[PDB]
Amino acid sequence: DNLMERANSMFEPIPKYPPVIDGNELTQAKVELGKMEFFEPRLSSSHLISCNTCHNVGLGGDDELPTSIGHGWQKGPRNSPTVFNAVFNAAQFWDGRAADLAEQAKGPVQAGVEMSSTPDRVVATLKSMPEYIERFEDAFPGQENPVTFDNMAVAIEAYEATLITPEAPFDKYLRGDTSALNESEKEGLALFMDRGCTACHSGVNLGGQNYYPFGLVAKKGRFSVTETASDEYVFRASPLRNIELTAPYFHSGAVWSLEEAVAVMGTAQLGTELNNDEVKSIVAFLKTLTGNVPEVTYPVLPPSTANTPKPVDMIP
Numbered sequence: 001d002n003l004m005e006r007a008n009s010m011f012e013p014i015p016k017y018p019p020v021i022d023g024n025e026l027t028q029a030k031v032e033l034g035k036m037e038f039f040e041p042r043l044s045s046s047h048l049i050s051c052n053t054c055h056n057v058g059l060g061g062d063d064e065l066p067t068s069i070g071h072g073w074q075k076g077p078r079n080s081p082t083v084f085n086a087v088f089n090a091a092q093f094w095d096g097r098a099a100d101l102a103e104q105a106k107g108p109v110q111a112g113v114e115m116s117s118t119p120d121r122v123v124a125t126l127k128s129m130p131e132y133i134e135r136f137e138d139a140f141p142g143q144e145n146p147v148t149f150d151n152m153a154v155a156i157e158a159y160e161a162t163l164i165t166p167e168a169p170f171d172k173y174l175r176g177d178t179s180a181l182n183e184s185e186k187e188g189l190a191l192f193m194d195r196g197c198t199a200c201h202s203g204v205n206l207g208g209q210n211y212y213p214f215g216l217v218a219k220k221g222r223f224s225v226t227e228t229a230s231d232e233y234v235f236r237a238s239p240l241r242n243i244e245l246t247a248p249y250f251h252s253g254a255v256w257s258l259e260e261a262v263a264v265m266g267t268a269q270l271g272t273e274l275n276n277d278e279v280k281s282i283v284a285f286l287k288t289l290t291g292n293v294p295e296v297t298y299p300v301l302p303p304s305t306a307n308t309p310k311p312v313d314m315i316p
């Protein structure tokens with residue numbers, strides 16, 4: 001098929017294994033430790049929050065409500081991106097000044113380990129529990145003092161890399177299964193490519209590789225995507241893979257409807273104008289991007305000890 005051939009020139013299917021990030025070779029011990037930490041709520045000062053709290057791996061890998069905390073964030077509330085397939089994105093979620101990218105931006109996997117809690121607090125918490133020390137020793141053989149903030153970050157990054165979702169219908173199509181998509185979805189695929197959405201949403205995650213001075217604004221009829229004043233603020237073109245599971249949408253999380261998310265992105269300025277039927281065809285296509293959520297065995301964490309820093313009280 002020429003459609004299949006074109007699709008393969010613009011996109012790629014999720015591979016069986018994730019790409020190695022910054023030389024972080026995955027091992028069973030690192031991944032297991034990273035998983036424990038991903039679900040570990042005692043890294044937060046309140047002891048009520050863990051990565052899974054905002055990136056629920058059972059519900060889209062993201063958060064349902066905009067938030068102002070996490071990753072040492074000090075500004076207004078913003079939507080949370082999904083951890084699913086984040087490892088394939090070169091650009092990270094961005095909701096701010098283009099001028100700040102140079103010094104503050106990093107890969108998704110690395111941005112994920114930016115924390116609000118201080119390094120000393122975290123290390124002390126982890127060292128207070130014998131089992132964590134053993135897990136760090138298992139993950140970092142040969143290191144005399146394995147429990148460090150950097151090693152913690154490396155183990156979490158190892159686990160983040162495993163959160164990929166292969167075998168979506170679209171990936172099967174890319175790989176040759178012409179029947180993986182029905183006619184309605186194939187029409188959506190052709191339109192996605194013919195209307196220029198691929199200028200910003202392409203590659204392995206259909207987005208996630210570049211920043212653009214175009215973002216959602218609250219004026220289908222209630223929202224729109226427009227250029228920011230003086231291109232001062234930029235946003236990362238959203239990776240659309242698994243979009244079916246990641247509502248709400250955009251940097252603000254103001255849109256819950258997938259059809260509307262598609263509609264506001266069809267504009268004359270961007271050269272992506274669409275009529276109502278085409279919007280619906282593209283929606284059909286985007287629904288074929290849902291892959292297999294990885295199976296996760298909930299980790300059994302170790303009990304706190306006398307040396308484990310205690311939860312910090314509620315005082316806003």
Ligand code: HEC
Pocket residue numbers: 038049050051052053054055067069070071073078079080081082083086089091092093108109111112113156160
């Ligand atoms: C809610 C209070 C959060 C907690 C706890 C954690 N994360 Fe998060 N994360 C959150 C938001 C609102 C954002 C957009 C953020 C800016 O601050 O970066 C993110 C982003 C990420 C990413 C980037 C994904 C991408 O750009 O494709 C990753 C991979 C990520 N978060 C991972 C992660 C991990 C491993 C966490 C525990 C150490 C964690 N986050 C906590 C909100 C929240």
Ligand code: HEC
Pocket residue numbers: 192195196197198199200201211212214215216235236237238239240243246248249250251252261262265266267270272273274282
């Ligand atoms: C670059 C100039 C783009 C073109 C052309 C298209 N999109 Fe886009 N899209 C772009 C950005 C920078 C963003 C993030 C905006 C923000 O305010 O956060 C998006 C976002 C979307 C979404 C929401 C995805 C999500 O939140 O998970 C969808 C559904 C989407 N874009 C679809 C889409 C379609 C169908 C397009 C062709 C008509 C299209 N986009 C073009 C940037 C760009």
